[PDB]
Symmetry: D2
């Protein structure tokens, strides 16, 4: 490398590309938002210990959140959330306006960003999100995934 299934890249053409790679599973997701998502950073599980993924932090003073999955027993079972521009940041390129997170234990981590734009949805009937791919310019411009069993 060992490779993984990389399903996706939902978002747009600009920003700067970042592939954090692959790990055993997710422990914490922490993002900043207002009308679009700006910051996205994750705390992975690496063989029993926590691993802090690289950060893709925004300069925009957006509203802040921390999603804390209860590890082993809880893992996401669905990722969805629209995509499109934001004439305000004067950025012509498509961008991730929202991004909601469902869980196998039921807990859904409420829509973040305004549900305006075109919808993308990804339900997992069997599998495991194991890492994140995507781009980040001023906000998070595109999002991608890493799957495994």
């Amino acid at each position: 490398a060992s490779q993984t299934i990389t399903v996706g890249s939902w978002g747009g053409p600009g920003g700067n590309g970042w592939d954090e790679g692959s790990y055993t599973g997710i422990r914490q997701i922490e993002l900043s938002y207002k009308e679009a998502i700006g910051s996205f950073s994750v705390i992975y599980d690496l063989n029993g210990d926590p691993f802090s993924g690289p950060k893709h932090t925004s300069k925009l003073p957006y509203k802040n959140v921390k999603i804390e999955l209860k590890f082993p027993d809880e893992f996401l079972e669905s990722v969805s959330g629209y995509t499109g521009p934001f004439s305000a940041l004067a950025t012509p390129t498509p961008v991730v306006r929202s991004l909601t997170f469902k869980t196998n234990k039921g807990r859904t981590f409420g829509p973040y960003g305004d549900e305006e734009g075109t919808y993308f949805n990804l339900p997992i009937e069997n599998g495991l999100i194991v890492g994140f791919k995507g781009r980040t310019g001023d906000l998070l411009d595109a999002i991608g995934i890493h799957m495994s069993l």
Copy 2:
């Protein structure tokens, strides 16, 4: 019982559940369509030789298309769609209304069924659709996918 990453479920809850399991590759898809997708049946590749999976047919007089891939060098890199109910089959439940496939070699087997309702899109950077899962009643009620490296 070896297992696969089963991604998705896109479509409604009506129809009879079907699963065709996992193979080694896709050799030819066959579908009928007309304002919605009726029949669905894929011919797979089992260890270098062709293996026809179960047929999932509709009695509806729908238009017919044969999608045949050049098998080893060509595979689907994207499956998109629009799932939306259909008041004509008097079906209140959601149904997959359109279906578009895009190849790693550059050919998009143009949108079959009319592009109406909520769009779905699943792009792949490294992975392989290795078996189809789905529901069928009179139309292709739903669509599921299985994956591998």
Copy 3:
């Protein structure tokens, strides 16, 4: 193709190469033996339904045996068995002499052929024997293993 992890070449470079392929799992193994292993063909599982793998039969008038596992619930957790030349077969190269299979339920299919030669050993901790590869000329010149989750 999708690929699987292929561990194995145990035996010698002689004979003709055979790769039976990767399937869903194993339902019955069928071999022949005297002083060494001669024929080896298996019945595989192909998505809930049995599937016959090609026969790799040895012309040698040998003792016969059918090993059948209780499918789903019982599966191979171990494979092992002695390899060396056979001055009789006037075979200048090393060939497989004995082969013993151990089960997750306790069942162990007694050494078939003679325990003579250098020994090889594969205990599986997590994983699944999914297809058989190897070489066959008069006897089984060599054996390989396919694996998945």
Copy 4:
């Protein structure tokens, strides 16, 4: 909670069981030995940067090798090595007496420890050793491997 294929545990039941877990690849191995293998510590690759796995050290004053593979073009292609007891450590239980590492590039990191006891041979045709698992007490009592595509 993702899994990888773990094969084996070639050794004896003595000592304290350890499992470094899985990563992206093997960059360096560092062991000690005289008549049996004493220390075993590996510097893994995690997504592009080195990640040191835990050290499993041994007080026995042994020779000290430092194995560095050229990480992306070079990876292990086979592991082999003799398992037998060791009268001198006054131990009743089988230990990993010897250990040899072959590479896909051609280099064979010749025998470390004596070639004595029963033999084991893990040869690989397709796949990646992606993590080591095992048991240490005074020396290296057992060794197991993790696999991925």
